[PDB]
Amino acid sequence: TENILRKSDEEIQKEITARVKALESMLIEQGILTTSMIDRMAEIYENEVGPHLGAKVVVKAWTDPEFKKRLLADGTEACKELGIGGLQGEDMMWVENTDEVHHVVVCTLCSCYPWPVLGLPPNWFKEPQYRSRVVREPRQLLKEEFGFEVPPSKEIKVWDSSSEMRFVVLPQRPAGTDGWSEEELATLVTRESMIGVEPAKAV
Amino acid sequence: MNGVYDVGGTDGLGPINRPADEPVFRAEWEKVAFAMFPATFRAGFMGLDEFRFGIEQMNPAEYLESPYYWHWIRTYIHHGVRTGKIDLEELERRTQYYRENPDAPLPEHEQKPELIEFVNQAVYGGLPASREVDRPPKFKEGDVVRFSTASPKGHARRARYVRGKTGTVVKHHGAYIYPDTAGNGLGECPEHLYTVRFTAQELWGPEGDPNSSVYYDCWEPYIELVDT
């Protein structure tokens, strides 16, 4: 939104860059931060940990009833079956979308998100607009922002992760996918479908 | 604290800004800011709860419109000063130095295998907040409870929109680090954790969606029994 008091994005970026490089120089001199540590962390979340991991869990649940039961019983233990877990995903509780219920996740108090299965969250999820409105007008937000219309008769359960428990949505399997392979099914699972702001891809 | 950051239910924040796609890191400084998390954590600057409290104490106007990772930088500086691990005056001098010389080199330093080990361990091993306590859970699934109306001035996970509201316990997750003590440097003091369901009508009154409910996690001290 417009703010007549705010500097340009260019000036803001230039100032932040200087402040960060300065703090970085100090932490480095203290011996607690190094360039390799910086590169390793960035490498992990730019190429290793992402929503493709969550997609693997979803497709297994879609094609394995028993795994699905385990996933819904204890998300953390179930995901470990696929070697998935870790930082900010130590405690996961998966919630299943049905014809009667739709789930949507948010972290109103900050920006908590299940990194192990979804990677780092997109900026809109961490920002004030989505966080403030989703617990108050979830139905209208889904329609207006994501073009996702959820029938008035269908209950919308909004999960506000105020603790370390991370909530992940198991979207319904799209129709017309009978017998599809896990790899083929995965093409329909999106980061958005696991946050609940969108259903899995149709067709 | 009753900070502006506690945005759940706030009106007037505007439409969501969502590009079709975006990079994980929009600029190099974001990568640095991100990596500083495990670095300062390992160095004892703060724990996760304190980390959040530092961000909650930001200038609200700055918090609402500044790039996300800038919040992280603010909390690092906050705790760096708090613990005396960061000299503000020196930080200011260096900031000006890098403003005038953006391409100046960083300090010479040796790489440390222990730091990479820490990163890999924390990422794939995680930092579990679950703990065992000697007391049994006070509540159980089905219990009708009321969220406390306390308003701590320090860190807590008591969203203003749920305070004083009545809901139903959906699940007991066991005990976990308690924010009200941890985020204020008072220790883990683990408490049983429960997910509680609040109808939209209960939270927002008539303006609430007739067919919606919000699930919110409550540590034991946050709730009191209404009906078993």
B185 backbone φψ class: left, alpha, beta (φ>0; ψ -120 to 50): left
Tell me whether residue A110 is annotated as binding: yes
Alpha-helix runs per DSSP H in A64-177? 65-73, 75-80, 115-118, 123-126, 128-134, 138-146
Q: Provide the number of CB pairs (under 8 Å) joining chain A to chain B.
A: 275
Residues of B in Cβ contact (< 8 Å) with A20:
29, 32-33, 73
Print the domain residue range for B67.
Answer: 1-126
Chosen for mutation from B42, B50, B141, B217 (greatest number of chain A CBs closer than 10 Å) is: B217
Collapsed DSSP state (helix, strand, coil) of residue B46: coil
Active-site residue A111, yes or no? yes
Please tell me if residue A122 touches chain B, with a CB cutoff of 8 Å: yes
Residue closest to A52 by CA, chosen among A122, A118, A121, A125: A118
- The total of structural domains in chain B comes to 2
Residue A25 assigned as binding residue:
no
Residue A193 falls in the annotated catalytic set:
no
- How many Å apart are CA B27 and CA A16, to the nearest integer? 11
Query: Does residue B87 sit in the same domain as residue B150?
Result: no
Return the number of other C-beta atoms located less than 10 Å from residue A135's C-beta: 29
Same domain, B3 and B104: yes
Yes or no: say if B131 and B176 are a contact pair by the CB < 8 Å rule.
Answer: yes
* Domain final residue pick, B103, B126, B149: B126
- Residues A94 and A71: beta-carbon distance below 8 Å: yes
Alpha-carbon distance values, B36 to B29, B114, B169, B223 (Å): 11, 15, 37, 36
**Cα B185 from Cα A18, distance rounded (Å):** 30
A79 carries a ligand binding annotation? no
CATH number at residue B185: 2.30.30.50
Instruction: Based on the fold, state whether residues B120 and B170 are members of the same structural domain.
Output: no
Cα(A184)–Cα(A165) distance, integer angstroms: 30
Q: How far apart are CA A107 and CA B52, in angstroms?
A: 13
Q: What's the CA gap between B144 and A81, in Å, rounded?
A: 35
Q: Which of B89, B104, B126 is the last residue of a domain?
A: B126
Burial (CB count within 10 angstroms: exposed 0-12, middle 13-18, buried 19+), residue A125: buried
Which of the following is catalytic: A8, A36, A79, A110? A110
Spatial distance between the Cα atoms of A177 and A164, rounded to a whole number of angstroms: 35
Domain boundary (B126, B151, B186) is at: B126
Q: Which residue of A has its CA nearest to B213?
A: A157
Which CATH number does the domain housing residue B74 bear?
Answer: 1.10.472.20
